[PDB]
Design a protein around this ligand. Sequence first.
Ligand SMILES: O=c1ccn([C@H]2C[C@H](O)[C@@H](COP(=O)(O)O)O2)c(=O)[nH]1
Ligand SMILES: O=c1ccn([C@H]2C[C@H](O)[C@@H](COP(=O)(O)O)O2)c(=O)[nH]1
Ligand SMILES: [Mg+2]
Ligand SMILES: [Mg+2]
Lengths: 194, 194
Amino acid sequence: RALRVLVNMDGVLADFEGGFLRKFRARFPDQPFIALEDRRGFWVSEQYGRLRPGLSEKAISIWESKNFFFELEPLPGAVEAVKEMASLQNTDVFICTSPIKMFKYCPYEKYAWVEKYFGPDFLEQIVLTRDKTVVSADLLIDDRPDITGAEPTPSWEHVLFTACHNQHLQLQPPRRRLHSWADDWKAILDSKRP
Amino acid sequence: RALRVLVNMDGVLADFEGGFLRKFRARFPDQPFIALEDRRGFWVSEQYGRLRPGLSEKAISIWESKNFFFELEPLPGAVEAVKEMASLQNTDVFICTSPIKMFKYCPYEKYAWVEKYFGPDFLEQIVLTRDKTVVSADLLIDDRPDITGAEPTPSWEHVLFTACHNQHLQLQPPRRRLHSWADDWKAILDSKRP
Ligand SMILES: O=c1ccn([C@H]2C[C@H](O)[C@@H](COP(=O)(O)O)O2)c(=O)[nH]1
Ligand SMILES: O=c1ccn([C@H]2C[C@H](O)[C@@H](COP(=O)(O)O)O2)c(=O)[nH]1
Ligand SMILES: [Mg+2]
Ligand SMILES: [Mg+2]
């Protein structure tokens, strides 16, 4: 009866792309890089890898570093929208995020980031998982085009959140986008209510 | 088509009760304590609290301390059973665990513990969430009797894993127990396959 919405973290709430590019450039000022307008495909590391050998590993070292996740800036309108969304009647919001393989900092910083922007009480709403298909909900708002895993028939509708890496992508028709948090997320939610 | 089983961590894989009692006694040798045979109810902190004021907060300080989760011993047969379970055909196993409120160490140590006992490749199978009802599966093996949250009708069958705190509990009849990892967990799984 309550509408359940999973909101992804990196690329939706937290500006992973901008934070990564900034830190990459500062740390490796003599390497080439991918401007955000030139990003294509979810996997940053694979595009940097195709650009020049050794660059996959240098890219990875940015988000494996301490404070990378913690210091990400919120995307415009994200914190305001999620706060409003969670306060709506008959609406439960979970933040659903996949940690990286190297686990020293990332889980911790993700909890700390959520505490900073949404408050201690919002920590109960965090789901950390590498497989989103085993989390049930009516909606998943996520910038990754291909969301797969152990459940072949997820209960959520995936709404693609626009990002640099996917903005050019033609989706197969039933699939739908939320173009930014300025876009009308309330209408998308309402379309799934009885 | 693949059977999906969520296996809880504390009280099922990791010996939370024994580790907590040991550390509590060493740190607070002049306080009274609850012998494992005398444990009742999921909430350790509430029983210690009823035993004498200030004791809830002393209990909590044990599992909020660094290395508490990391240094938990596996329960007998747990690692062997889960490894066998995951290797079975048409069987996907996720470890589903709820972190404490204080997030400095617990998420990290839980990943580290899983790496230590199950290997790096098993990290992909971890789901950290305070709400298990929004994780979909055929089975949830968990020592907590009352598993509630945002989804009023979870897709899993909850099988109660026996622990000191619940061993005396009469369950409402349809509900079922796995008495230890020496008990016949394969028969429980098979009962849910077509
Ligand atoms: O090339 C990449 C791009 C992203 N990520 C990771 C970083 C995050 O931990 C996760 C995405 O986080 P969420 O969008 O699920 O919050 O993917 C990688 O490992 N490699
Ligand atoms: O009185 C208690 C007993 C347990 N826990 C926490 C410790 C664990 O983080 C969680 C149980 O962990 P899992 O069984 O879900 O792994 O509950 C408490 O906060 N208070
Ligand atoms: Mg994302
Ligand atoms: Mg437990």
